[model samples]
Target chain A: PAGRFTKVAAAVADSVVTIESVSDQEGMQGSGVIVDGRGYIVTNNHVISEAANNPSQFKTTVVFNDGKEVPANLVGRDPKTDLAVLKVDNVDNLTVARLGDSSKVRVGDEVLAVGAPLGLRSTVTQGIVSALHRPVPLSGEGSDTDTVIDAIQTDASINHGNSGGPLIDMDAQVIGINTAGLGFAIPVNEMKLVANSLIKDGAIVHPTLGISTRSVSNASGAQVANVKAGSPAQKGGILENDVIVKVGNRAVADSDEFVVAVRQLAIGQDAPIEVVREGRHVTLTVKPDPDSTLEH
Target chain B: PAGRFTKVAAAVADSVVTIESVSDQEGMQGSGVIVDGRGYIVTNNHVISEAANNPSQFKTTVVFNDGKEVPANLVGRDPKTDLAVLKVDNVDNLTVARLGDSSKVRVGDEVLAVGAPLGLRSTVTQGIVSALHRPVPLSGEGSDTDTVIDAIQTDASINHGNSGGPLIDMDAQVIGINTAGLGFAIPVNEMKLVANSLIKDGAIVHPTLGISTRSVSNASGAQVANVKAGSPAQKGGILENDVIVKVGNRAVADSDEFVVAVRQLAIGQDAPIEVVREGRHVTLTVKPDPDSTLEH
Candidate 1:
């Protein structure tokens, strides 16, 4: 098993890009993975964020496995996804890694992550895909907001410099871009959508609900507060002092569950909502608006 | 040559001491060297300075090469010398390290340092004595008004936990106490006198000069300034504005040279002094006092 994974890992190891940056006149280095043969590489946004700010003082260099040092240009980045795209200049025959369907990945699925950890070149660490589509809230640098939801968890070690490398399958296909952990990854399927949008628009745009709500529990139900006038919830006939017990078939037991249920609804789609007010269960039909924004 | 030093280091490795202390609920550790058969250990004063402030909270433990842990009591310390003396409560049959005459030590003499670097039990690193009688000023925690003037420089691997350990000669005798630098030691000949005084008096009683002087550097001579009226230099007929060419037979070339030359004079003893006033060398005799009372 080890030999098989090692062979597959070696194939992708050549594509793992070594990143070199300068901060305060000191050289800092990390790792990235080549995702496109024409020199497009994917890495953590934090790796290039500082260099992007002061281009004159900071220098970025990418080193390949064959010991070739090449200049790279910053393409685009999604702070929400913690992924940044880079383009290497004037290099051909680049071995881009294959993309695997992360949705089909199951628990105990063997996975390998290739990157330079602690400045080590092209190191491969292997483990099982511990969980899929697990939600993990993160707050830190390069994150536009304080919350991150829906992460793919893996047992593979991702330490200080292992950020933004490829979490791949046994066939050397990229399943997820190793992102924020609790030993988790941002699914490659989700990243494919966000990366395309960021490369075209330079920012990620998503639907928002301009209202704060608490989930229902045994003693209390969904409570809405500070609803913006003429907002989506306001237009949906959501009233103050209302206890929302259910959102369609999903039971809202906590704030996290309510948020997940709300995100599941499509923009401009109306849905049935159940609430308990003064020990009376009431059902209402609510339509979501595209302009509503909610701070998580 | 390295092999020979390694064997001798192994024979005397049991005499090294691993020091441990607890500060603010955090465990701090350092190293020491056993210098006497009656369980007298020598270490840096900074290693045990915190114990002086909080005697109830501070605890000292020494671990031997065989993994035996023994409680030790603080005996005496001299911050000026950066040396501390400790005594184990009850221990017998201890292997006393032989003290070599550091006065005869020459550059390029093969030497080895024994210490518990990084608090790792007992370790020995080999190198050659790079220089002798070198003046290295101590500052911050382990330093006082009196700076260590004569030092033995070596290339031995003296790291964080290696402080207070021993720099040994090929004959298994300690030539110096590995005190500072990535590789430097305090010569045993100078340390012996201070250690003896500390063991007898629980404190150092060196004399002091109540004036601060900066060395002047020029083609003509060096000088000191800011001498107060009625000070020892003023009472001894040292003019307010005078350039010092030499102190006794030692040439005063710069600030460091002046400090080293000043340290050579005995406390309460009249010594011949020379100064350059108006480009002419003038000799005078001044009674130098102990440096312990000097505060700067």
Candidate 2:
């Protein structure tokens, strides 16, 4: 008998696509989700950045469920979030996947990862969300921008080429995008910000506090190295030696987690940032900026 | 609302116990499951073998659900199966766990791993049965016996102190014994054989084909290095250099898998062993023996 997962897989299979990118130096494969009916696809920035970097010498292709292959254009990419948008021309009747509210995703929720793992297209693997709000650092690979994602962790058998796929819930909705497997997924809530901005402006203006930080050796926090003059951090009285202990309601475990916590904040919202300064605890209010001049 | 897992955990939490072993050299912790109303606890052989080996210099204790710690006597151990039995003396009331038949366990079945992980007692982690009939090799640590178990694989967050715990099915039954993490579990069916034998005779007679083997370089099978004189392999005409491919109904992927497959066969049963020799397939019938002379 077909189980609940089989039914869910059948409902969402058409919306997932296998993405292949080739450059003069090397070639790679990944998976993507159809986000728009007019053939807009979403994948990890690392998946297509090689071809996007040298467009004339590389090619990016998207393979549909029916084995139809089409060349894709580099709509835009946000390496800081490890997300990229691709567009396929003259495609009608495409199945666009419904992105679910990731804030509603709980630790025990069952999920299935759908992708082209090890060149096996349309593969599906299942497991529960192992942990939530995991701070994970992902290398940029070929790009210059490294990503620190406030990730959704699952135990689904995700492998190479599974990146950029959809982590689908029992309702057949994508709650997260497969970023780097251990396996971690960028929550659809966080992905929406980068994806929407990229599709709209060809680049994303990320929310930032404008503070350079590093992991503290003896504590579980991020120690500030420098604060940008006239930036949100400086305006909020964040000093050079202030160790960031918490961001809003989330505990900042280290520098990577601090970056992810700040990045997750809504732009122009006054959030409390807690820091340890000179053996004293202090809280400061700062409105994160959509720093257009900053490079991720 | 409290989830389904919470209800299941409440029913079975009392059946699980934390096992601690301390020798003059070192101390370690794991978990165990109560399998008898008379207070017989089952855990991984590796969990208490250190104390069992040097009984005078070590102490083995079992901590119950009610935070009561009791000294446990080493009933028996089977390193081949990685199972041990401990008797908690003079206990009138104990919650014995129901051991389910592993043959009925299926992939994608919701399960929970209950144990002490990283010194945190009574931790319950959840996931689906990621795989079944997995051949996993486990190091005996300080012991001489290395075991290859036919394991039930789950993604239920098994950690250092989780060994010897219960991997419970949704019915609150013990489906497998948590062994080495990646998280592999010794199926309840396999554990039952060793546990029953240990409880009755304090020792287990393992069936063996009596063939020394190594992995084939270019093939997926165990290449026979030598056949024991007058043993099952010799009586069945298994020759040196013959690559054993399939044992009964299962395909032997490597030498470790071949050992595990042979060990799983019923004693005194005539099973067909398929081998590749001189580019040809051959089938030989052999009845495995309860090789009392073999040390696992």
Candidate 3:
């Protein structure tokens, strides 16, 4: 934990927040970023998903960059994106983090990871953008929506308390949100979309194709595990044990790419997928259902 | 049968290739785009998928800008995205089209639809970007991956053979690919991502979260219809008739929105979902499994 970046850390540290939120059974500490001068804070959904479980009462405590702690309320949270926005009771001189444009992000850019690591505020680490658009598939957390971040991977250390902090650049722009260990952060671009949507609407509608699949051993494609009854795939004539080889016209290497591509489709659009069924290549036109608990 | 685009149509028409792909069963016509001068062509997977169910002899006939028809081979196809790439033999004077940036596209942008309709090549029609990111969920046709297009809805007529054509801007840049009916085109930006992948490796790997749902009359959220056996949702305690109100605190509006939100997830990640079970809101953590046939 001993290294340099005191200059870099000191710059954006004030924008970083130390979080102390209490839930049903346990009290927890984590990190957050101040995105608005009006006392709005953004953090990982898990920080409050635990305490917010009861929903009847979800209280959040925000310790600002200067150690001014105050009560916060949950505005909205998207577990899929691991993002949550909170409205703090007291507001004044809240340091707002500068957001960077993700489209301009490159792999070799230098980055500073800032968060409340080890229960410490203003914790900072240094690293390069290990990768750009690092596809990190995060699902099965039981969130109704699935989240796949084009995560910014960095060598910047992200400890347990770093979940909602910022990954900054020399220019002090918050490029991403620290989400996982090994310093993976959600790109600022995607974060902004989700955050703004949460702040304004308190929800988002994602598209889905009702289908399930698993990898086949020694096979070249994903085997259909189960087709949702009356789903687009099932109605389109997709059957169990069918191997999905192509989506629309693009061939599939595996199931992961298929899911991502499927996500690219809109809620009502149709995509003709190619599959191998009983040694025959058949095409099926699949549509996205209105968002359901059923999806990948 | 009657319209005018002499100025705009003629410019992009040369770049728009007429596809006369034939098989032993049927002889039909379609349209395509010349992405590279090296005889690499891009078209809707359905153009050939309709006639070439058997891969052993999936031959494509490419009719270029100059009435020159050449034999082409399938490089790859992704039905999930409704895109495919073909390599032609002996390339010369092939006209390549301009690809536009969809991120910069606006709602009222003027566009031209070019394709082969009624056995015609370079057929052109005009329309405004009726809408951007129009989600149209389509399912129930037999295939593998379901297609939900964030379609570029154009009022221009899209015919049977126009499925693989281009929606060009006044500047003659290809902004999207036409599907059917409403001249809906997949954004060129997304098209490139899928097309390039298909061109390079002939496949993509998609991820999934195994769950399904439908909307009940006067319901607040999506009602869990059927959760796949051992799916992340089922294991996460999701059950039939459970109304999902929030996706990780992001309150869902309806079933369509729910499906769209769920499809946003990737396989292998965990999502914590909030649902109303028998008048009580409960949260569950679901893991996304690989693509399964169990789709809505």
Pairs that clash in candidate 1: A208-A292, A209-A293, B206-B292, B207-B290, B207-B291, B207-B292, B208-B290, B208-B291, B208-B294
Clashes of each: 9, 0, 109
> Which candidate should be chosen as best, given lDDT against the real structure?
2
Ranking by TM-score: 2, 1, 3
Positional deviation of residue B252's Cα in model 3 after best superposition, in angstroms: 68
Rank the models by DockQ, top first: 2, 3, 1
User: Could you tell which candidate, 1 or 3, scores higher by TM-score?
Assistant: 1
- Any runs in candidate 2 off by more than 4 Å, and if so which? A1-4, A116-122, A212-219, A225-231, A234-242, A268-270, A294-296, B1-110, B114-166, B173-296
Best by DockQ: 2
| Model 1 alpha-carbon miss at residue B249, Å | 2.8
**lDDT, candidate 2, A230-250, per-residue tens:** 899999989999889999897
Question: Predicted chain A of model 3: TM-score relative to the true chain A?
Answer: 0.84
Chain A accuracy as TM-score for every candidate: 0.78, 0.88, 0.84
TM-score of chain A, model number 2: 0.88
**What lDDT does candidate 2 reach at residue A30?**
88
What are the per-residue Cα lDDT tens digits for candidate 2 across B223-282? 999888889989998989999999988898788899888877889889999999899999
lDDT of 3 at B46: 71
Expressed as tens digits, the lDDT of each residue in A131-185 for candidate 3 is 4554466643333345565577665667665677888876788988888524678
Q: A20, model 1: CA deviation in Å?
A: 13
